[model samples]
Target: SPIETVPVKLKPGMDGPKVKQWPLTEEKIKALVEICTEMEKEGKISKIGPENPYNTPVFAIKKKDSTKWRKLVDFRELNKRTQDFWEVQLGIPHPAGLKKKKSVTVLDVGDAYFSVPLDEDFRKYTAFTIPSINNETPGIRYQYNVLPQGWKGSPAIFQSSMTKILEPFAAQNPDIVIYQYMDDLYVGSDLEIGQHRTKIEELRQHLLRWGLTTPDKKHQKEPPFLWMGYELHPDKWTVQPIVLPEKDSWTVNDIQKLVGKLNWASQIYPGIKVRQLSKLLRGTKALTEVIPLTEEAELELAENREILKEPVHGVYYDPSKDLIAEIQKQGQGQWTYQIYQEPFKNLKTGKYARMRHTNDVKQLTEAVQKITTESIVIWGKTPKFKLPIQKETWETWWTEYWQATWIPEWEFVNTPPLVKLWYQLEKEPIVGAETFYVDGAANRETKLGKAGYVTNKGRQKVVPLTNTTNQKTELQAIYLALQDSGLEVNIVTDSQYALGIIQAQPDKSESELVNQIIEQLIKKEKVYLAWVPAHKGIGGNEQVDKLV
Candidate 1:
């Protein structure tokens, strides 16, 4: 079959300075010469001179066989100079269409892009300079004669050409639907087995008549099929996604590959939480930019696995209107301190409103006042009320809203150290509880001293510590306070280190005092650890600091 002619349309301002020349290695030079020599012999390439305005660089990659090299010419600069005038709106075969089909036949256009010819004028811009393998000629330039690979416009042009050729056949045989995904063509039919085979054969003959030859090895004759990395089995009524092992480690490349596969799977299974996975993709292009496997990311991965495991029948479905009505009537809004995936429509006026967060009280006030319709049904476990609230009452309403929606553990666990302290400011003072203030001091003049002041009663203990550093004094003070053996006690300190130790389990150390404190905590009802700044307003800390 002969290749068809196609014109390359480049964007304006392309006739600028020539692209910077890239150096080629000895092997690449030999490979380039061999390929170009064969292409020139076949009239698929021609020698060009310095008159060409554009000159792209050339590179090569080892094919899967490892012995053969696939020459790749970098056309990014050339591609950038070209506008995309062609659109390939190839639709995949719907599950319903596939289910009704008795058999399927797939065809591939071998050397897909090379089947199109390019004019000499446009091909000049695809020109690349190769260092001469011969010492006689130091530099040699060549341009592709046919539509070579790596040009930005090749796929779309090929699609345009193929679509024009197939349109008439598609119109003639309405029952036999043909779908093109890049180079592959899928001709399927729900007709009887004999009729299906005949239609496929007719389509094959028609394609060949138009100078489009399907590679013999690439043709599938009523075999179990795979389409766009998905196993489409009409006999079993299943369409399963092909997935590889989770590349658990974090590298930009690995993350891209993992996320890309998951994203593809999401097309088949829309339930895959792509929004959550999107966080991993942020600022991840560079090798140095790393996003570790977080607890959230791991959970998303597990969720994705569960989604992929779901059984899907080869059928299209529509959401029942009655079910949608039932949901709207009982629809309760949930606030995870995050925006809703989609706004729920009101069954009344059908107006959509979602739970939103904002720091601007004025903005919220105006929004509430402007909302006139009673269409919105903001249902949840949280308190419910109408909007257009008084400006003076916004503060109280905001607090109530947060309190109703709050989860203590989630807030505590997710906040950073500094933000946690800021949150502590808003939290109610833990009053009428057994509280003790601990302070530690160490200097060259006085080795170390620690103090624990009982808050309720005017009681204080100042003890000089032996063989203790400044940080160790803080731990020692905490240990001494633990000796109180109260049913419940709140230990307040300025040291983050001391707070951290008591927050969880204290580490095993040679110090007997610290271990004893841990034992007391294990036996106690509760030991609350709080962080307070030193040398400032808090009377307990000030007095304790003085005692130390």
Candidate 2:
């Protein structure tokens, strides 16, 4: 089947410079206002709440991802901060997921003013107009630290504001829920007792009339509704974040922190316990002395000699267990060197021996580590590398043993998954100056052809990148991913060319196909693409790898 490629070219970040009364110039926004205005005239809008209690800090607890409330700042402080840590940061998940058991009555309002703080350049925040700066103060204001749309704090502020607007309804229907953070509002009650569908529609219309829009991907209404960050999955209620983690090797601190986080989650997930994971967290130890061999014993240990087995090639064997025994006895207190094989070329005796190397204290440390991680002896002071004993030798013995026991398990969690999105997008139109992603396998298959896109909420869109080569498949996958996720996203990759392609326009070859499609997407949706240096162990980037 021939795919339907729209003639419309995507102009990313089309919405970047908000055109008050335009769509593709000036039509779509006007139509939306007209439709919503008509609904308002029909009294379709709901009056859901009494007034909200607080005013200054708008608060919203995401219902979908987790019961975490986000606080909105005018971001006056953050906007002026030149430090990347403050000015540029992903916001907390909002109205987060489905509602606890029902949807919220979103009482939204628009025409809120905004202002972003500036640096020495003053380009970050511009004066709305020279006159406005000199004259009147607008009732509503915004800043980069707290962007109006898709900001970390926008949801909370929207929720909180809606709560205040709908406070009256909350008062009358005490059974109805009320939670706010900025603009998002989540309301719920038992289905047996509450008016479920009627209530949600009532609130949805209210927010729509007030110039606010609900998420298209999320918004459940049948009975158990979800809003903001909470969800009512059958008899359950929960919240979940939408983004994936980046994959990278975990350090000691990383392991420790992850373990700590898992401690709480372990309660919810069965088959996990502190005791069962002890071997992974701490190491184990073992020890055994080498048995001495006399002439007869040596002969017995060597076993029946093969008649035809002369030491192969230019090699010869001589019974020297006595020599090995003397050296082992000399270092009886210290670690004994086990010369299991001697590939040596002898001049006088005419014998061959294995390569020789001196094992100094430093070399011993490495060998001890290898031994600890692989084979251990019981002679160490502490059989366990945990506590109660302290000696360099005992420690080295236990260390090697401890390492041996824990490495296998550690490798599994820390090793980065093959991130198809990163691999493919290593050559496509990028987002953000840096993009980080982790692995996500909902149905167990996470690959290039079968890529998935997730919005800020636990809303997902799964689409195949391309049906062909791995590179094309990956690029297509990322393209679809960025197109589907309605957010100002970022992209990180090992391919500098991919970054260039995404940052600049597409090449002539791809320009006709992927480039045109991306352009159309850009025009349609407001997207910002950027590049990040590859292989740096940045937190978000590493997280993306880890997740994959």
Candidate 3:
């Protein structure tokens, strides 16, 4: 079999002046030359004429596993200028989308970018320059003879080449599950029906013949393994993005890396309740500043250290689930939630919920919708009885009151996009009106329901008795207030349960009296409902409280 190649095509007329390059140390210059010689010999890049117009800066970063530096051609400027690109979606198949499989394995097609040769016409556009050690040594400039790692167009080209090479093998062995994320190739099959070890080895040898290679060390062949940063548990039919790896150095890298990965893990598991997050936020002020971990952070890190090695709970993520965001009270805000398969939840234990911190709960949901999948049922709550909505997320207020409804997601946002959402009835506009305060009184044993409303106009009404609970009375008072007020006016009360009738997702739980109140809001074509604190110095609220 002959080696395959593809052209890194760019949008027409995108050829431009060379992007600025950076200076390098003597040691790095020496190191880069050595690597370039190897690349040149392999025909991965060709010595190009002076001053290639499309040059982008070239650099390298040290690989964690090896002392070798991975050369990265800075294609940012070139990629930024180009558009209308052809893309091949090398996807990771969803677990739910797969046939029942008994085993798993991942093959890192090491430096897969170098496998495909580049076409002569587009080669010069992929050129880069390596700076000199000093005026004594001239800089090195070359155009890629093969696909470069950072180019935006490299994937689809290389993907098509690999696809062409693998078509026959894939067609012959249809049992093996194989899809890609550019470089990472996951290949597996139902071990219960047939062994896939020989099948994988056969495929490996087949790719090798076409110049593609996967090191044995990089090939993971077993269940309960890690691939593309996600931990796969086939037995439970569960998968989870890694929250973190074990190590707590009390540095910004520790904070940032953990938060960065944890932030991404939210799409799969947006469960909240990360303790000592203040220390994490404080460390991110600027990397070099050492964070003095408080007792809370120390304890949190110590506990998290265990979870790093072994995830406490790994569950299947269903994007269709309803997501509920809520915040704790002011000054001591904490975002908390539950994960439900329906709403979201722990797969080991059936339940649905979610939580996390951010200025915008809307951005959080926006990302969840934009990145992975869109959810139909979205709800948000805040227990802010006194303060204004300073933070977009009701972290303090939601966390304070409804701690049980949700827990875990991590994120960092600089600019939050406006999240057009449902259940924002609490944020509905209010027109100043003949202000009336409403209240409900219900005894544990008797008076089970009493509706009362009052205003500065000296109008006070107490309508009583029902075979119901306190929520029944609160909603009834809202009904009486809207009917008697005769016109649209602000009706204030502090009962979340009563307010839920008009604010939350409509439910059959609401009765005729509450439905009438909802009907009144619709007829008036506005939301005049205003929620105010109880027993906390508001004269009208206290007046209505006494009447009820």
Candidate 4:
């Protein structure tokens, strides 16, 4: 039978900038050239002119036998431009296969991606550059005329393509069960062993007939069938992580591999928490970025590695045992927080056990909040939860936490900072440089006051106010300046009484205008409240005196 291949379509207008590959060693380059030349002869790739508009980096791994190199190219830059990519996760089991507990056989289609050819038009976009070993000749460039192995769409495309190809065998062999994960095929049965063998023999022949060959030892014709890295028998399935020895320093790639293994192990083990990795997971684009494992992270990796050395069987849910849920909640109205794994009091021991298998989910832990703490639910007689924060006493805790002097941590409210305010200015405050002056004018005869502010540019604005006193007007001007200014700037005032109230950091009940200034200041960043000389020629300060 003649070989058949499929053409791939890239997303239109995905003409991205030339992707630069990380350099390779001299020896690696020579080896790469040798491998590419071999693949070129195999019709998988071809040398192309350097005038191509698109390019990507090339990578490969030696085949399992170490005799041939697999052509794996970095298509991330190209893949970003692909259309409607959908990846179906493998290792998902069929309920019928699991329920029937049938003995199974596994098969792999050799040269899965290479068998699928690239469309002629899209081949130029998959071009890669190689430096010339010969100094005389220009550098060599080649385009993959076939499907590259590492493409995000490769597995899915191959899976669907092979699924259609296997339809004939499936319709013919109705008695045997079959599941295809990409190129790997599963043929199983509960009938006599020969029926299973007959299914495998015919399926293999059909694949060969279709110009696909199963490599020797690639097909499992008997029990202990492996699908997606898990062993399957007539009774049960098992998965284990291949734990390597510890490393002194882990790179971003190392951390990813460890995390991948740990995540897979967690699926089988269930309810395992290794949440201290917040710092270790701070990876940048560089996969080789070396991360010095902290003692906490080191201990977690070591602990999980030790625990997973032996196979773990996750406990199935049971209705008889008393179920207790421990939920960690923080402040309300869109800003919610929950701990990944918290210690909850276990019913059996009364001692705190890590809350595992709880259904509650939370993310973006805002540390701890003042409004609420962890709550326990027995899920039985009376299953209601209420907030004790509504009792009005929580205000004392909220308002009193900072002494009104130290700023409380501020963030969004509707889903929605320390300046040394006492510092004296060395010279006149400048306008347009985040510097402004505020004052208040009062007439004893009229019992009237008005708040006034000015920028050093001689810009002046005055606001009307109630309660006409120099102190009240001064405080009112400070509040008005803070509320009115679009930019975060210093408000230089000469009144000692108003500045004293700001410096004292009085509670909200102390003064309306005083606390309002404080509350307004909370919204601004690095706001300075400086007091200038009473009647000095300081630029912005003296400018405000005339306005009042």
Candidate 5:
């Protein structure tokens, strides 16, 4: 097969002086001379003197799995000086519809970058220096007759040539599909044996027409196909990105390499959890850093493989799942749950039910049984005043709360200075000059609710509400406390939702209520919305919980 030349053109105003050549080692110099000799033998490059307008250094690096080296040129200066006359579309083609393919074959273009010939006029720009092996002999430098690997324009030019070479095959045969990404080509079909044989032969002839040859090891006859580390198995009908073999631990470079491959594979696999992969990437500070997998990370790596194997029905929990797992692994006891109310109305039955609610009680019980194999004490008293509730109402609340709802996510903002000060004083039972407690209750049955406020001055009031939301009721309870107050007032409650709103800007519909509280603060000069944990026997919060 004849070698070809790809042209190079400098960007306007870039034909001037550039950086000088870099020093080369004796081994590197010898390697470069052999590479030039081989290229010259193949008519891929020709010897040139110091007549070229541009020049750059040459070097070599050892190939993986081989003692042989790959020659490279420092084309940075030339690349910077050149213009991109052509756009390179370099990516793997879609493999989605190829799933049912019976026969799959891959073709590797030998010395792919150099297959495209360089134009005679522009060949001088690709010139690179190779120093003499010893001081006695004169050095011989050369310019490429074919496209070199390190040039910026090499990929764009080669892709163009390959596209042209394969265009006819793509157009003529609809049954045999051809997909390419840079140097590699994938030919696949679900056709019967006769047509398959003909198509493969036709494809080989087509390649030969363009001076291309496929190596024997590159072709495949059946599925369980592997390409660029991605796996596809026809029998299982699964595609998974490559995963590293599990080690006792991994270096930062190992972690980074695996993560990068996953990142690329995720784009095609569709179901990959890229964000979780990103978290694994965060621990690596540098390539040289030797960081072992944290137990949390180790679990994630295992989980990642499991998900890749059977992605359709794998666990898709939040990042907190690992954190929760870590805590449990150490035999620590912790319970966390969000408290929120959602409407319980069934349109089909036209039935109204209680607001949905659940806590960590069920999980806590299960954990104790699993951990100690013994009974756990139920320390808190159950609500005693629940006299009437329908079977339908109970069922609706159970399903809505346990089956449909989850903990609401919230950010942990630091406690404000004023709130912090109030907590310290309250521990000593230092009642503010004007102390008040407010509670909001929404009736599950009557569709009626009220916000009640009681003060140190023996003044109290109950305000009626629409019973639309618990948040509204809590805010209204605070509003009642602010209606009449002293210079320094303390508003205490168990509603973190209400406290959060007061601490920040309230929603637009509730802005009037929030502003009223804000105005009260402007006049009174000091007001505190303090938080207390509920149901642990705090007098004010317990009384409020009872009312609701």
Candidate 6:
């Protein structure tokens, strides 16, 4: 493959002059247009959207129902399937087991130009006629197709667009902690080489989807991505962003974006109780001075009372109320607000709670945990609430409460064009199962159900088999209990993933490998596979759920 190196366009920066050059000759113009047209015809982009005038090439999703019937190869379906596969895989407990500790990463891809308005009159828009200011003219131009800082939504819009493109490859497996600040993404994960490879490939596909290429020296699609001033050392349980500018001038919006990602990390962290964040937020002064900031490449966050000048609430939970309002006022003005009443779990006791719009990660996590824990100790049990109650009865109070206390804390202005998802460790089992009792000498932690085994009086020499990972241990215990039974090993796991591994394609092997053996057994039916929903109280699955 020939490496193509187009000169870096002088992107509009916090403080860099636009470096302009003259347009190419007629021959070059014809060649460039031909290349772009070929890519567009192949469905890499659709030079047809009204939003993207000048009809330049930008990554576009192919609608399945397009009337053209052009047969252009669209990667959208591939990406969707890959995303689905990941959902299943992630739902299952991995072979090695997932970590208890929460990790976070922020990814901000550098300035990607999306669109420049046609009505810019060439007078007010600096990016128009002046080759030094606006590169929108037909002369030699250097800059991303998408410009950074179009608005607060830039990070989200670009990030989502990129992710959608890579949603295809079946083998592109990566578990990353990512945060975004417009084009600058912070990739955080573990220090393992395997983990880094997954993260890098994730970015690579995303870049390809954006019709951009990342240099190997800058960010190898392998290990050791750097971020926040660290190497993101491989094999060490860390994550790295592709790049971090030495001192790129950031707008107020950029700062707010970084704060959002940080708050997300705080939300995911299980050690809320230990952090005592409430004290830090009691007053604006304390918050500015006390919160611990990680030292990263961009900011030496240890203790800058000046940096702390930003309000804690502003940094953590603030949303884009202003931005959204402006967009509505300036653009469509059709923004309508709706109120929903969904029931969520009580934190302390893990019971049920209800609310309208949930608060951003920080306030909600704190409030949920604090209230739940307090209620649990007082009540001695989790919630046993009834559903199908009066929706109207609670909706008003919930709405009022959210608006007064929590909603004010964060801004919810600019929503990305792409779907953004927020996840948490589910309180109830994602799959349904029920519980039953018939136990003898088993550990509480692993949560594997024991098969029937009886003794006359019950005082026999019982031994314990210890293992590390909950997934492996549970499987081992299940296997042991199933041994010698008249039935062949017809094991059932509540996880979608356990089923996949059981039915996984055999890996290439010279001879007898574990995968090969499993493969043969699958064909013979010596073992049967079944997926049982958890928490619905199926005896076997319910038992396993509790054990887990």
Question: In the order shown, what is each candidate's alpha-carbon RMSD?
Answer: 13.2, 33.6, 14.9, 16.3, 18.0, 28.7
lDDT against true structure, model 2: 0.33
Residues 334-388 of candidate 5: C-alpha lDDT, one tens digit per residue: 2211111111210000001111211122232233233221101111111111112
Q: List, residue by residue over 1-548, the lDDT tens digit for candidate 2.
A: 01111111113322122212111212322333343344335333211222211112222323466643232223332223322221322343322122234333443333331221112122223111101222344212221222233333334333334545466566656766755544344456665534665666666665455445554434524433454433434434333222212223333444344444334222112112232222233432322222222344233212312211232111112233211110111121122222111324210111111112211222334433443432222111111111111244333443433234222111111212110111112234444432323122222244334444333334444554433443444354356546555444443343454445554332223134465545544444344444445457755444443333
lDDT score for candidate 3 against the true structure: 0.58
Per-residue lDDT over 1-548 for candidate 3, one digit per residue giving the tens place of the 0 to 100 score: 25555434456666653677778676777778788889899888877777566677777678885888777777777776555456576454444233335666777787687787766776777777778666556557788777677767677777777778779898998777786777777776775534677777788898898888885644545666665555566644343546455554456656766656544443434333244644467425577665666777666555544444544443454344533322222111233223334333332211122333222333333333322221222212111111123344445434433333332343332322222122233355455656678898788787567888887567888886768678778878888877887545667887977765565423123147655765665555344567777789867787778777
- Residue-pair clashes per prediction, in order, are 0, 114, 37, 0, 5, 64
> Distance from true position, residue 464, model 3, in Å?
24
Backbone clashes (count) for model 6: 64
TM-scores of the candidates are 0.50, 0.25, 0.51, 0.44, 0.51, 0.23
Q: Which 10 residues in a row give candidate 6 its minimum summed lDDT?
A: 325-334
For residues 410-448, what per-residue lDDT tens digits would candidate 6 score against the true structure?
Answer: 223334321111211122332222111222233457643
Ranking by TM-score: 5, 3, 1, 4, 2, 6
- In model 4, which range of ten residues has the least summed lDDT? 356-365
Per-residue lDDT of candidate 1, residues 1-548 (tens digit): 25456655567655722677666778778887788887788777788877776677788767886876788877777777877765656454444223235667788767777766775557777777787655557567788877778777788888878888888899999898777888888777779978976776778788787766674544544455655555656553344554747564667666667777765554334345544455667655576465677787788788878877765433322222221111111111211111111124221111122333222232333333222222122211121222323334444444544233221111112221111100111134344557788888776566655555555566667777766678888887887777763756777887987776554332333457666766666666556777898888787787778777
Compared with the true structure, model 2 gives a TM-score of: 0.25
- Give lDDT: candidate 4, residue 450: 91
Off by over 4 Å in 6: 1-110, 114-148, 170-206, 218-368, 371-548
**Is 2 or 4 the stronger prediction by lDDT?**
4
